[PDB]
Ligand binder design. Structure first.
Ligand SMILES: C/C1=C\CC[C@H](C)OC(=O)C[C@H](c2ccc(O)cc2)NC(=O)[C@@H](Cc2c[nH]c3ccccc23)N(C)C(=O)[C@H](CCCCN)NC(=O)[C@@H](C)C1
Ligand SMILES: Nc1ncnc2c1ncn2[C@@H]1O[C@H](COP(=O)(O)OP(=O)(O)O)[C@@H](O)[C@H]1O
Ligand SMILES: Nc1ncnc2c1ncn2[C@@H]1O[C@H](COP(=O)(O)OP(=O)(O)O)[C@@H](O)[C@H]1O
Ligand SMILES: Nc1ncnc2c1ncn2[C@@H]1O[C@H](COP(=O)(O)OP(=O)(O)O)[C@@H](O)[C@H]1O
Ligand SMILES: Nc1ncnc2c1ncn2[C@@H]1O[C@H](COP(=O)(O)OP(=O)(O)O)[C@@H](O)[C@H]1O
Ligand SMILES: Nc1ncnc2c1ncn2[C@@H]1O[C@H](COP(=O)(O)OP(=O)(O)O)[C@@H](O)[C@H]1O
Ligand SMILES: [Mg+2]
Ligand SMILES: [Mg+2]
Ligand SMILES: [Mg+2]
Ligand SMILES: [Mg+2]
Ligand SMILES: [Mg+2]
Lengths: 371, 371, 371, 371, 371
C-alpha cells in the first residue's frame, strides 16, 4: 500500500502518494466560519468549510489559517483539516499506509510533538516521519551540495548542505514571508483607494500578487520609470467585475524581501540573509555553495526573483566567485517532490517511526536524526 | 391534521393548507363600517363587513385597512379579520392544527409579539410560527442564493441570501409601496378631471392600476411619445358605466418606483435600493447575487417591471457582470407558496412554538431564530 | 399702464389694479337668465344679467354659476362674465395692460389652459399669468413660512410653504366649501318650515349665513344650551319683510366643516385636514408650520373659526408645540392682495407669458413654474 | 498676520487662528439642496445651504456630506464649504495668511493632492501644510509618548508615537466610526417603531445619540438589567414635541465599537485594535505605550468609553502592566488644538509649503515628511 | 590632575580615575540609530543614542556594537562613544590629564594604531598608554604568577605570567565569548517558542542570561534531572510583563564554553584551552601555574564556572598537582582595577607615550614594550 506524502505546510496543503511525480490534491489550509448570524445547525447546512469549499463560500466566511509563521497555532482547526485532506479529499483511510509530514526548521518542539501525537492518536497512522522542508527541496533537485532558500507564506529559511552533510549551525530563518508580502500589499493599495480589509478580501489580494507582482531588477530604476505611465500599469479584474489599476506596487511589494525595513522588519534582505549564512560556513565550502544556490518555495515564483538574487549576491561576493542559482520549474512542489523521492528510497525505510515504537518510546522520538 | 398557512399581509390575506399548491381563500384585509346613519343594531343587519363582503357593500362603507406599511395599526379590526379568515371563510376551528404567519423584516417587535399573543389567547392555536416574507419567497423559487425583492402594497424590501445563509446586516426596507402608487394615481388623475377621494373610490383606483398600468422601459421616450395619441390611451369603464381616458399616468404612476421623489419620497429608486444592497455585501458574493435577482410580490406584476429593472441594474453594475432577474408566474403567491413548502418540511417541525412552550417562556420566544 | 389683477374665483370676482390696496370692483360671478316666458329679444330688454345686475333682477332669473368647485364648468357664461368685468365694470380695454389670474391647486389642466386661450384669443391680453390662490394669500400676509388655509365657496385647500419654498407634495384639497355650507343650510332650515328651493332663494340663504352664522367653540355645549331660548335665536328679516327664527342652525351649519359627515362628506374635518397635511411634512419643518397657520378666504369670516381651529389643532398636536393662527382683517381679499403685491414686484416681471410667447410655444407654457 | 488653523475633517469643520486656545467657528460639513420642486433661481432664494444655515433649513434639504470615511468624495461640495468657512464665516481673505489642514492616515494620495491643488489654485493660500490628525492630538496633550486613539464620524485610527518618534508601520485604521454608530442607531430604533429614514432625520438621530448614549461598562449586565424598567429608559423630545422612549439602544449602539460584528463589520473591537497595534511594536516600547493611551475625537465623548476601554485593555494585557488612559476635556477639539500649537512653533515654520514652492515642485511635495 | 583609566572594551566601557577603587561610569558601548522613519533632524530630537541613553530608547533603535571580537569594526561609532564617555559622562576635558586604554592580545596592529591616532588627533590627550587586559587583571589580584583567564563578550583569552615575567609564546585567544553565548541563547530559546530576533531583543536575552544562567557542574546529570520539573525552571519576567519559562537552557547555554562544538566552534573547551596553554610551557613552571589560576572577566560571573573549571582541569592534570582557581569578587572590574593600580605606580610613569613623543616617532611606538 506504499505510503502517503503530505506537505502539510502553511498556506496550502499538497498531498499525493510516495512514488507520484506530483501531489494529487492541492488546496488551501483554511478554515471558514459562517460570519453572519450564527450558523444553522438544526437544518444542517454546515458550520465549517475547508480549503476549496471555503473558497466556494469565501464571502460569507471568516477565514482563518491554523498555521502561522510555520506554527500550528490552532490545533482544533488543523486537526479538522488533516481529516478533510486525506480522509475526505484523497479517499484514504489512515491505517492503509504510513505518512510523511514536514516542517520548517527551528520550530518550537511542541509543534512537531503534538503533530505526531495526533497522527497516532486521532488517526490510525501505522508509522510516521517528519522531515525538514528545505532538505526535501534539495532532494527534489537531486543535488547533494547547496543552499536551499525555501520561502513560502509562512517562513523564509536557508539551509546549507555539503556533499550529503547538513550544517545545522548555519540554518537561517525569517518570519518575513508571503503573508507579510500580502499584508503589505493590502496596505500599500490604499494609496490608490483600494482598501481590502477582510479575511476574504485578503485572499483576493493574494490572487492579485500571484498574477501581477514581479521582482524589480533595479528597484531605483523601476521607481524612476514608474513616474511615467507604461507597461507597469495593469488592470486587475476583481470578482465583481470592477477593475483595479496597479502601479508601482506591482514591484514595490516584492521589494520588501530585499528591504524588509519597509514592513518594520529590522532585518537583512534575503540577499544578505543568504550571503551571511554562507559567510558563517568554512571558506573551504563557500565556493561550492555559491554555485549551488537552490531556490524553492512559492514566493520564489515571482518573475525576476532569480535574476535579482543573482545580481545582488554577486555584488556582495568577490568577483572571482562563480554564482549559480537553481530555479527549476515546479518550485512550488519542490518539498513535496523531495518527500515522494525520500519515501520511495529503500534505505529510508529504517527512519519510520512506528506507532507502537512511539507508544513505547514516547514524544522525544520525533527529534531523532540519524538517517 | 397537517397545518394552516396564512399569508396575513397587508392588502390581501391568502390562506390555504400546508401541502397545497395555492391558497384556498384570497381576499382583502379590509374592514368596512356602515358610513351613513348609524348602523341598525336592533334589526341586526350588520355593523361590520370584511373582505369580499365589504366589497359587495363597498359603496356604503368606510373602508379601513388594519395594516399599514406592514404594521398592524388597528388590532381590533385585525383580530376581527383573522376570525373571519380561517374561522369563517376556511371553515377551520383554530385547535385543529398549527399555523404559519408572516411579516416584513424590520417591523416593530410589538407587531410580532402582539400577533403571537392573539393566536394563543384569542384563538386556540396549538403551535405557531412566524417567518420573513422574503425568505419564504426564495423558498418558493427553490433557490438558495439570491436577492429577494418583495414588494406589496405595504412595504418594499430587499433580502440577501447566499447558499442558505441570510445576510441580516444588508436587509433594506422602504415605506414606498403599492398604496403610495395608488394614492399617487388618485392624485395624478385629477389632472384629467377624475377625482377619486373616498376609501371606496380608492379601491376603484387600485382596480384601474392593476389592469392598465405598466412600467415604462424608457420613461423619457414614453413621455415623448405620450405627446401623441396612441395605444397609450385607454378607456377604463367604471362601475357605473362612465368611462375614463387614461393617458401618460398609465406609466407615470409606476415610474415613482424608480423616481420616488415624485411622491416626496426622499430616497433612492428601487433599482438603486437593490444595487446598493448588493454593494453592501462582500465582493466574493456580489457576482452570484447579480445572477439570482428574485423578484416577487404583487407590485411586481406590472408589465415591464423586470425588463426595466434589468436595464437599470445592468447600467449601474459593471458590464462584465451577468445579471438575471427571476420573475416566475404566481409572484403574487410566492410568499404563501414558500410557507406551504416550509411547513411541509420534516426538519422544520422543530421550529414550531407550542402554545404551552410560549406560555412557559413568554413573548421573547417569537424572536428566536435557529432553523 | 401697469397691470390688472383679477381674482377670477368662484362665488365673487374681485378686480383692481396692480399697486392698489384693494379691488375696485367686487361682484358675484353669476349669470342670470329670464326665467318666465322666453325673453323679449325684439324689444331688446336683455337675455342675460351679470353679477350685481343679476342681483337687481334676481327674482326673475335662473341663476347659474359658471364655476363650480373651482372649475369653469360653463365656459360660455364665464367668458361673458370676463367681458362684463374689466371691459364693462372697470372701463378697461384688454390690450391696455397685462393681467393676473388665479386658481385653486389640483385643478384639471384644461381649466387653466382654456382660460389662457381665451385671454389671448377672445381678448387682447398683451401678457398673462396664472397663480395659485393660496400662494398669493401668503404673500399678502408677508410671511415666507406657514400653512395657508384658503377656503371659499368653491374649494377648501391647504398649502404648505417653508422659507420661500413650497411643498407641492403635501397640498390638500376638498370639495367641501361654502356652497356645501349654503346648501346644507337650505336643507336644515326645512326643520323649522323655511323652505328655500330656487337659485334666487339660495342667494338669500347665503345672505343669511353670512350675517348670522358662527362657529361653535364647543359644539356639544352649544347644542346643550340650544335647548333653552337665548341669544342663540335670531330673527332674520327677509326681502319681503317676513321674518325667520334661526336656532341651532346658526352654528350647526359651520359645524360641518369640522364634521363633514353631516353632508355625506366621507372625509376629515378641516382641523384634521390641516393637522394631517402638517404630519405629511418633515419633523424639522412641522414646528414652524404650527406657529404660522395663515387662515384666509371668505368662509373663514365666520366668527370663532380661528378660536375653534386653535382649540382643535392644539388638541391634536403635542402640548409642547406652540400653535398660532393668523387671521388678519381682509381675509376675503387676501388672494387679490397678494396678486397686487406680486405684480408690483420687479423680479416677478420675468414670469409674464407674452401672447406672442404663448402663440409660439403653445398651451403647455401655462404650467411652467420657475419664479 | 499669523496663520489659520482649519480642522477640515468629516462631520464638523473647526477653524480658528494659530495661537487661539479654541476654534472660533464650529459647524457641520454639510451641503443641503432644496429637495422639493426645483429651486427658484430667478427669485434668488438659494440653491445651496452650508452647515448651520443648512441646519436652519434642514427639513427641506437633502443633506450630503462631501467627506465620507475621511475621504473627500464630493470635491464640488467640499470646495463650496471651504469657501463658506474662512471666506464667509471667519471673514478671512485667503492671501492674508497661510493655513494648516489635516487628514486621517492611510488616505488615498489623491485626497491630499487635490486638496492642496485647490488651496493654491482656487484660493490664494500663501503657504499651506497638511498634518496627521492623531499626531496633532498628541501635541495637544503635550506628551511625546503614547497611543493616539482618534475616532470621529469618518474614521477610527490608532497612531503610536514614542519619545517624539512615530512608528508608521503600526498605524491602524478602521471605517468603523460615528456614522456607523448613527446608521446603526437609525436601524435599531425601528425595533420600537421609531423609523428615521431621511438625511434630515439622520441628523436628529445623531442629536439623540450625542445626548443619551453611553458605553456599557459590562454589556452583559446592562442587557440583563435592561429587562427591567429603570434609569436606562429616557424620553427624548423630538423637534416637533413628540417623545421617544429609548431603551437598551442607549448602550447597544456604543457596544458596536467593541463588537463590530453587530453592523457586519468583520473586524476586531477597538479594544483589540488598540491592543494589537501595541503588540505590533517592540517589547521595549509596549510598557510605555500602555501608560499613555491618549484617547481623543468626538466619539470618545460617550460616557464610560474610557472606563470600559481601561477594563478590556487591562484584561487583554498582563496584570503586571500598568495601563492609563488619558481622556482630557476638549477631546473634541484635540486635533485642532494641536494644530494651533504646531503652527505657533518657531521650528515648525520650515515645514510650510509655499505656493511658489509647490508650483515649482509639483503635487508630490505634499507627502514630504521631515519635520 | 592625575590620569584617567578607561576600560574601553567590547560590551561595556568602564571609566574612572587613576587611584579610584572602582570605575565611576559604567555603560554599554552601543550606538543606537532611530529605526523607524528617518530621524527628524530639523526638529533636532537626535539621530544617535549612546549607552544608557540608547537603553532608555532601546526599542526604537537599531543597536550596533562598534567593537566585535575585541576589534573596533566601526571607528565612526567608537569615536562617537569615546567622546560621549569621558567628555560627556565623566565631565572631563581630554587635555586635563593622560589616559590608559586596553585591548585583548593578538589583535590586528591597526586596532591599536588607529586608536592611538584618535586619542592624539581627535582628542587632546597629553600622553596615552595601552595595556593588555589580562596583564592588568593579574595586577588587580596582586599576584606575580599565574594564568589569567579573561573572558568577556568580545573574546576569551589565556595569559601566562611567571614571577613578573610574561610568556608571550603561550598566549591563547578565542572568538568564543559572551556574544556567542548570547546568540546561542537567542537560538536555543526558539525550542520553547521564545523568538528573539532584533538587536533590541538581543539585549533582553543578555539580561536573561546574566540573571538566570549558571554552569552545570555535571552537565550529563543536569540534563538527566532536567527531565523532571524542578528548581531548574524559572519564570523570567519580560519588559512587558509576559513571562518566560526557562528550562534546560539555563545551563545548556554556559555548557558551550566547555563544548564549543554546540555553536559550530571547532575548538577545545575552555578547560582544555587552559590546560593546553599550561602544557605549552616548561615543566618547571607548570606546577605554579596550576595553583594560581586567576579567572576574571564578566562571563566568569556565571555561578559555578569556578567549580566546574576546577573539576575538569583537575581531571586533566595529574592527581598530584594542586590546582587553585582564584575568583575574587569584582571580576567584572578586574582589568580596570589593574589599570588604576598601574597608573598609580611611580615607576610606570616612564611608559607614557607623550603626544609629542608620538608625533615625533610615529605609529610604531604603540607596540613598544619595556616596562
Ligand atoms: C472596492 C475595493 C476596490 C475597488 C474600488 C473601486 C472599484 O474603485 C474606486 O472607486 C476607487 C476609490 C477612490 C478612488 C480615488 C480616490 O481619490 C478615492 C477613492 N476607492 C474608494 O473610494 C475607497 C473608499 C474607502 C473607504 N475606506 C477607505 C480606506 C482606504 C482607501 C479607500 C477607502 N473604496 C473603494 C472602498 O473603500 C471600498 C470599500 C472599502 C471596503 C471596506 N469598507 N473598497 C472595497 O470594498 C474593497 C472591495 C476594495
Ligand atoms: N504565482 C505566484 N507568485 C508568487 N507567489 C506565489 C505564487 N503562487 C504562490 N505563491 C506564494 O507561495 C505561497 C503559497 O505556496 P507555497 O509557498 O508553496 O506555500 P507553502 O510553501 O506554505 O506550502 C504563498 O506565499 C503564495 O502567494
Ligand atoms: N395586476 C397587478 N398589477 C400591479 N399590481 C398589482 C396587481 N395585482 C395586485 N397588485 C398589487 O399587489 C398588491 C396586492 O397584492 P400583494 O402585493 O400580494 O399584497 P401583499 O403583498 O400585501 O400580500 C397591491 O399593491 C396590488 O395593487
Ligand atoms: N360674512 C361672511 N361669513 C361667512 N362667510 C362668508 C362671509 N362673507 C363671505 N363669505 C363666504 O365666502 C365665500 C365668498 O367669498 P370668497 O370666499 O372670497 O369667495 P371666493 O374665495 O370664491 O372668491 C362664500 O362662501 C361666502 O359665503
Ligand atoms: N456628546 C457626544 N457624544 C458622542 N459622540 C459625539 C458627541 N459629540 C460629538 N460626537 C461625535 O463626534 C463626531 C463629530 O465630532 P468629531 O468626532 O470631532 O468629528 P470629526 O472628528 O470628524 O471632526 C461625531 O461622531 C459625533 O456624533
Ligand atoms: N551576571 C552575569 N553573568 C554572566 N555574565 C555576565 C554577567 N554580567 C555580565 N556578564 C557578561 O560579561 C560581559 C560583559 O561584561 P564584561 O565581560 O566585563 O565585558 P567586557 O569584558 O567586554 O568589558 C558580557 O558577556 C556579559 O553578559
Ligand atoms: Mg513551503
Ligand atoms: Mg406581500
Ligand atoms: Mg377664494
Ligand atoms: Mg476627527
Ligand atoms: Mg573584558
Amino acid at each position: 500500500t506504499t505510503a502517503l506524502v503530505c506537505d502539510n505546510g502553511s498556506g496550502l496543503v499538497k498531498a499525493g502518494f510516495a512514488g507520484d511525480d506530483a501531489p494529487r490534491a492541492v488546496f488551501p489550509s483554511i478554515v471558514g466560519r459562517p460570519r453572519h448570524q450564527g450558523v444553522m445547525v438544526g437544518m444542517g447546512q454546515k458550520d465549517s468549510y475547508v480549503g476549496d469549499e471555503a473558497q466556494s463560500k469565501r464571502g460569507i466566511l471568516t477565514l482563518k489559517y491554523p498555521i502561522e509563521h510555520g506554527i500550528i497555532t490552532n490545533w482544533d482547526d488543523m486537526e479538522k483539516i488533516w481529516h478533510h485532506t486525506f480522509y475526505n479529499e484523497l479517499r484514504v483511510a489512515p491505517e492503509e499506509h504510513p505518512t510523511l509530514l514536514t516542517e520548517a526548521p527551528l520550530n518550537p518542539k511542541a509543534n512537531r510533538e503534538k503533530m505526531t501525537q495526533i497522527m497516532f492518536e486521532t488517526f490510525n497512522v501505522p508509522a510516521m516521519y517528519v522531515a525538514i522542508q528545505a532538505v526535501l527541496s534539495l532532494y527534489a533537485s537531486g543535488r547533494t551540495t547547496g543552499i536551499v532558500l525555501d520561502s513560502g507564506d509562512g517562513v523564509t529559511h536557508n539551509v546549507p548542505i555539503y556533499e550529503g552533510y547538513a550544517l545545522p549551525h548555519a540554518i537561517m530563518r525569517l518570519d518575513l514571508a508571503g503573508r507579510d508580502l500580502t499584508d503589505y500589499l493590502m496596505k500599500i493599495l490604499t494609496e490608490r483607494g483600494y482598501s481590502f480589509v477582510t479575511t476574504a478580501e485578503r485572499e483576493i489580494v493574494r490572487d492579485i500578487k500571484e498574477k501581477l507582482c514581479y521582482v524589480a531588477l533595479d528597484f531605483e530604476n523601476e521607481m524612476a520609470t514608474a513616474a511615467s505611465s507604461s507597461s507597469l500599469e495593469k488592470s486587475y479584474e476583481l470578482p465583481d467585475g470592477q477593475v483595479i489599476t496597479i502601479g508601482n506596487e506591482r514591484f514595490r511589494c516584492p521589494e520588501t524581501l530585499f528591504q524588509p525595513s519597509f514592513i518594520g522588519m529590522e532585518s537583512a534582505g534575503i540577499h544578505e540573509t543568504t550571503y551571511n549564512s554562507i559567510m558563517k560556513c568554512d571558506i573551504d565550502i563557500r565556493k561550492d555553495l555559491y554555485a549551488n544556490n537552490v531556490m524553492s518555495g512559492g514566493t520564489t515564483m515571482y518573475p525576476g526573483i532569480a535574476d535579482r538574487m543573482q545580481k545582488e549576491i554577486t555584488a556582495l561576493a568577490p568577483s572571482t566567485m562563480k554564482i549559480k542559482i537553481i530555479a527549476p520549474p515546479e518550485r512550488k512542489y519542490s518539498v513535496w517532490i523531495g518527500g515522494s523521492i525520500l519515501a520511495s528510497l529503500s534505505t529510508f525505510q529504517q527512519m519510520w517511526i512506528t506507532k507502537q515504537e512511539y507508544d513505547e518510546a514516547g514524544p522525544s522520538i520525533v527529534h531523532r536524526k540519524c538517517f
